Amino acid sequence: SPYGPEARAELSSRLTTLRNTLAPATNDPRYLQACGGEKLNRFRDIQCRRQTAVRADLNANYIQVGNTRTIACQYPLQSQLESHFRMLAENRTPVLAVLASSSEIANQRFGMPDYFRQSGTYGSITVESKMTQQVGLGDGIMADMYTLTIREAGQKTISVPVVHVGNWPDQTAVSSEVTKALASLVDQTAETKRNMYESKGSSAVADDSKLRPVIHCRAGVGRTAQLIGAMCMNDSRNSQLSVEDMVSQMRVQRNGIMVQKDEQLDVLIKLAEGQGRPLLNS
Numbered sequence: 001s002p003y004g005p006e007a008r009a010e011l012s013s014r015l016t017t018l019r020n021t022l023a024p025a026t027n028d029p030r031y032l033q034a035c036g037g038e039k040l041n042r043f044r045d046i047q048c049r050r051q052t053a054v055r056a057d058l059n060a061n062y063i064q065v066g067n068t069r070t071i072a073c074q075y076p077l078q079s080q081l082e083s084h085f086r087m088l089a090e091n092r093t094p095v096l097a098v099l100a101s102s103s104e105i106a107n108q109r110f111g112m113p114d115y116f117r118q119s120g121t122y123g124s125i126t127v128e129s130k131m132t133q134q135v136g137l138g139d140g141i142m143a144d145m146y147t148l149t150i151r152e153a154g155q156k157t158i159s160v161p162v163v164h165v166g167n168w169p170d171q172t173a174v175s176s177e178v179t180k181a182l183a184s185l186v187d188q189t190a191e192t193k194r195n196m197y198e199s200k201g202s203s204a205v206a207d208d209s210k211l212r213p214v215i216h217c218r219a220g221v222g223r224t225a226q227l228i229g230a231m232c233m234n235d236s237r238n239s240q241l242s243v244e245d246m247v248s249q250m251r252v253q254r255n256g257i258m259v260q261k262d263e264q265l266d267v268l269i270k271l272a273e274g275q276g277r278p279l280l281n282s
């Protein structure tokens with residue numbers, strides 16, 4: 001079988017080699033480096049590919065999987081929130097998908113600020129959060145939606161739709177069905193917001209660094225990578241892109257941990273199989 005244990009074993013062999021070779025060395029020229037005392041990386045071993053970095057002071061990467069353009073990042077540190085909101089505003093972000101659980105955010109030991117469910121002030125930026133609809137994705141998994149209105153004196157005010165999956169636990173894979181429902185919700189939300197900008201003649205529409213969905217979980221490598229993979233498979237432009245390609249693109253463009261659990265890779269495989277998409281490059 002193209003999806004049998006042999007093919008799966010080969011896929012894993014290739015991806016493990018790639019993970020091991022992309023592991024960051026100290027002062028690795030492939031990875032963004034902290035400057036001046038301030039912590040950059042939420043986790044020492046989860047680093048940000050230099051070439052695709054979004055801002056010098058964020059652990060955040062531009063990611064293009066086939067034709068699908070997104071930003072993947074870590075959950076921003078408290079000290080990074082002003083820069084994070086500037087990135088969001090500048091990108092005219094059409095959807096911010098947060099996959100870190102409510103339990104994770106509430107646990108102050110993890111230092112995950114509650115930045116999208118509450119209003120706040122971060123340097124010169126003020127942020128207003130409003131709750132909108134709640135959508136069930138299946139298997140009890142829930143998406144809570146918000147809008148974040150980002151203001152700064154002398155800047156255009158920008159509002160960002162948020163899709164928060166609050167009950168996808170760390171180091172797990174939600175089912176292929178839940179994943180497909182989630183990808184559809186996130187793409188639909190982005191599409192609506194992107195259409196508003198287009199209807200207003202925004203110049204962001206012509207700029208491939210902009211209007212990217214922004215996706216983060218805690219580290220930005222497990223749950224984030226499962227969602228990005230699913231989104232890529234929902235994009236009609238990506239015919240024939242293999243699972244090897246998709247995962248190898250996420251890893252070279254962010255870090256080697258992208259798709260963190262075997263069960264996450266298994267959901268990508270099952271979605272591929274459903275479409276008759278190849279696992280391996282010939």
Ligand SMILES: [NH3+]OCc1ccc(-c2cccc(C(F)(F)P(=O)(O)O)c2)cc1
Nearest residue numbers: 045170171217218219220221222223260
């Ligand atoms: N230190 O070894 C590598 C390493 C270190 C930390 C993590 C990690 C830490 C927190 C959460 C997660 C994660 F749950 F996989 P996410 O889905 O948020 O990316 C992963 C994953 C890999």
